[PDB]
Design a protein around this ligand. Structure first.
Ligand SMILES: NC(=O)C1=CN([C@@H]2O[C@H](COP(=O)(O)OP(=O)(O)OC[C@H]3O[C@@H](n4cnc5c(N)ncnc54)[C@H](OP(=O)(O)O)[C@@H]3O)[C@@H](O)[C@H]2O)C=CC1
Ligand SMILES: NC(=O)C1=CN([C@@H]2O[C@H](COP(=O)(O)OP(=O)(O)OC[C@H]3O[C@@H](n4cnc5c(N)ncnc54)[C@H](OP(=O)(O)O)[C@@H]3O)[C@@H](O)[C@H]2O)C=CC1
Ligand SMILES: NC(=O)C1=CN([C@@H]2O[C@H](COP(=O)(O)OP(=O)(O)OC[C@H]3O[C@@H](n4cnc5c(N)ncnc54)[C@H](OP(=O)(O)O)[C@@H]3O)[C@@H](O)[C@H]2O)C=CC1
Ligand SMILES: NC(=O)C1=CN([C@@H]2O[C@H](COP(=O)(O)OP(=O)(O)OC[C@H]3O[C@@H](n4cnc5c(N)ncnc54)[C@H](OP(=O)(O)O)[C@@H]3O)[C@@H](O)[C@H]2O)C=CC1
Lengths: 256, 255, 267, 266
């Protein structure tokens, strides 16, 4: 049986490493993207070249805003992403909420305030919520006899948000929401044997903070994070749910 | 005479907090959404005890426009109301909170308003309120600033042990915890303290209470508001970015 | 008149705690290990303000047997501290596990002794003594007929707001503090039926010792987000006192950081 | 061919962990206290599968001095376990602090009992692990850089449920809290030697069934995922993963393996 994985923000960096890892384990992969169409399609071509019909791409803005066709709501856009997996491959075994907007929202010195709120909160928390709902309904709507045997949802959190980055309040809040989503979803979806966990990087693939990481005194590679993600998706991890794993080289253990 | 703004001050915990702060000498701006009668009754009681020690302000803190007026604007206006009437705002208490199911498992705009209401009241409104509050302090010349600025976020001691079916509420509380820490850090330079108070079971609607280790009952409003009040006192000036459980040990239990 | 036992009461945070409780009307049993002169000076001050409101008891809380007053065990020494409260005043309403040894136990580089004594000292003072003290305290309340019990039993464990961001080289100390946090939760749960509340207070930097260059000391305190300084003893003891008040009677099993946001920082 | 020392390896989780590591090619030093028969049986199986891939060492990890052949301290007995790995195979790449005593130490409802309970519960769950880590760390530091292994990993078996204390188990819960502290402090201090230190916290695994079937069923039925306790393998696979080179950026973290049990409330 060939399992399917949906990965948001799959075009590059961690998202792309995650998709590659899942693909190397035999997953067919639905690569979501927002703006990185060229990289997304280039990745699909690589994956489909290795193994025919093992990759597709879907575009979507996951910000908590209406888009033009009545207006399309973020929920609808999310349901469509999950539906694209069932339409093409007839299944969706794994969901990885990786897409994430990250920029300052200082408390100390309108259009910007409102789009920032919906963008940061949508991508990091609200989209993943609706995505999980859509994913869950599909599974519930599948007759028990026909369900997969290893449903796994991974939320990309942040190992460092408890030690807030000065000026990033909304981003930090959204990640805090995502942690709550992880726990609440693990509990409510446990009956459908759908596991929900979180993976929190510290510093990965930076574009003198490296030297602060206790382990290796450097940021991590994408693989050093994606391997963790892949492991949590494996049947060997089927008893793990509702937990967040830090992948930070001990950075969260430090103090100023 | 210090001023305190308390959202959702009309009844229950919000009312207890206002009364507590008032008993310590605070002038209190009582925010309310729908409980206009209860809000005005309380103001009358407080103003009767001490002239000009209470006002009331109506506002929907759901992340939606009204009349268009954005949530941020409505929030700025709440804080402005304090400076307009009394010329100051020393304490902010983000207490207002919507609480109802958002099941993941068995409706179009039903989830739309739920999203904006649950997230607005519990997280986004508090964010804008804190911004507005922080902005007024920063805009106040150092010599004229108060000496005990305190923001309290009402969190939930039990959200790490999620209530089945309440994902969006739980998510909003998680955001509020993040707001508490991020704000404490960024506002430390203005000497504005930001903390959280997390009830377990308090003043139940109407069992579940027999589950509480301590006293085997839910708490009274005072048992929570006193903690809020203490965190606002100058005896607590070194505390910031922390959340205090007031749950009688409920979070220490397991199924 | 309610009684409070405070371990390591002779100076610094322990003294401030005793003074605070004393200012609220508590009679205070001041425990000390080596600071006899400081302890007696404090008792004198408290007894001078209010006759018979203070006493002092000496005890090594390290997890080692002591010279017969058959060797005396740590548990026995702990029971005796609690007993000294009931013997003199007929009661013990509040316990504050404040005493604490603090020094390096590096993982990397007349010798065994230092290893075996460090283990028992750091662990005893910070965790094991508090355990037996709580047991003793718990036993005395349980042995009191309901009709004679106090109405506000409170136990406070002094923890560390920064142990989750370990100080390099202090593994055993950090370990003992983690054990203390465990004790706090387990005790709150088990003693809830006797209405004995058990909480923790975790300082960050308080009355930071200045055995180092002025600038190096400016550095450390400047890392605290709020006020860019370590705290005074009062800024911590007032929190302790509050947790002991009847206005905190619904709080139990919780640890309160008093760190001015220090734990929110990163390297 | 890497070496792994596993304490309390004789049965249950310890055994599953040794088997897991053995299946990955590790040579395994199986520590035991009282389960000599089960320990030797396991060694035989492993050695039969791959010659000279298993040994055993007996040791009481309680924080008490043992009788020789001058009393032996816990630290010495700990160094000797680590030494046994370097003596036999010339290396120790992985350490798994699995050994653990677990029994009640009530505060109420009421000897050499309390002196031994304290030392046994605290020794096995915390103090031994401390000294073992020290010993393990010294051996690595005393190895010239050019000869060091490339994947040093220490895993501490913690408890996903200690923050929701089991009534009457104060000392155990305290020792587990100390073990968590040990995990973080050690990760930090040993980072420079590239020695990773993490924790794995089971919830309910291979739940002891010494009670009415209904009572046993009620207990496991509380676990949200599968409504059952876990198998040993469902825990050991996590341990094994954390030891793999794919996990070489993870350190100072504790991973719950509890099927969501810690998410529940009374
Ligand atoms: N890298 C690090 O040091 C850390 C990473 N993390 C988390 O790990 C995950 C991946 O990290 P990283 O690779 O750095 O991520 P990136 O910052 O590179 O962003 C990943 C993708 O998110 C997509 N995205 C952003 N906003 C939206 C939106 N509004 N709608 C739809 N898609 C959007 C972008 O896709 P596109 O280009 O197609 O528009 C982008 O490629 C993230 O969730 C991040 O929060 C956490 C802590 C540290
Ligand atoms: N009580 C408990 O057991 C627990 C309480 N808490 C938290 O403590 C705080 C107070 O608790 P409690 O007294 O029970 O709170 P309530 O549930 O009684 O709600 C408080 C007030 O919030 C206001 N409110 C709700 N939605 C909105 C909105 N969209 N815009 C503006 N105001 C709104 C309401 O004001 P109005 O009536 O005027 O419309 C209401 O009176 C809350 O933050 C809650 O989350 C956390 C855990 C447990
Ligand atoms: N001050 C700070 O920055 C921080 C403090 N804390 C905690 O707060 C509490 C008080 O802090 P602080 O005032 O600095 O504490 P101190 O370091 O000054 O120690 C307090 C007392 O503990 C006693 N003590 C130490 N070892 C033993 C022992 N083996 N047996 C009996 N008594 C012993 C000493 O009593 P004597 O002198 O009589 O021998 C000492 O006066 C402690 O628990 C500490 O761990 C936590 C984080 C930070
Ligand atoms: N199983 C579960 O549901 C849970 C397990 N855990 C943790 O997982 C780990 C393994 O679990 P599990 O397999 O159940 O463990 P066990 O309860 O079976 O104990 C493991 C081994 O520890 C050894 N041991 C106990 N005390 C000592 C001592 N004083 N000195 C030396 N060795 C000692 C015993 O070895 P011997 O037989 O040779 O004497 C025993 O076989 C433990 O650390 C445990 O705390 C945590 C939560 C739940």
């Amino acid at each position: 049986t060939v399992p399917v994985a949906l990965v948001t923000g799959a075009a590059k960096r961690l998202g792309r490493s995650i998709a590659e890892g899942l693909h190397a384990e035999g997953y067919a992969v639905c690569l979501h993207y927002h703006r990185s169409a060229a990289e997304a399609n280039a990745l699909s071509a690589t994956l489909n070249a290795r193994r025919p019909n093992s990759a597709i791409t879907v575009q979507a803005d996951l910000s908590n805003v209406a888009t033009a066709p009545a207006p399309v709501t973020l929920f609808t856009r999310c349901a469509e992403l999950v539906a694209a997996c069932y339409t093409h491959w007839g299944r969706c075994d794994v969901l990885v909420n990786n897409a994430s907007s990250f920029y300052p929202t200082p408390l100390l010195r309108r259009e910007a305030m409102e789009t920032a709120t919906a963008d940061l909160f949508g991508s990091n928390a609200i989209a993943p919520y609706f995505l999980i709902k859509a994913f869950a309904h599909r599974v519930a709507g599948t007759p028990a006899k026909h369900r997969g045997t290893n449903y796994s949802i991974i939320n990309m959190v942040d190992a460092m948000t408890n030690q807030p980055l000065l000026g990033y309040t909304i981003y930090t809040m959204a990640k805090g929401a995502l942690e709550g989503l992880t726990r609440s979803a693990a509990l409510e979806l446990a009956p459908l044997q759908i596991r929900v966990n979180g993976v929190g990087p510290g510093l990965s693939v930076l574009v003198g903070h490296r030297s602060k990481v206790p382990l290796y005194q450097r940021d991590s590679s994408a693989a050093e994070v994606s391997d963790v993600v892949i492991f949590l998706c494996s049947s060997k991890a089927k008893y793990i749910t509702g937990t967040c794993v830090k992948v930070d080289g001990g950075y969260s253990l430090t103090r100023a």
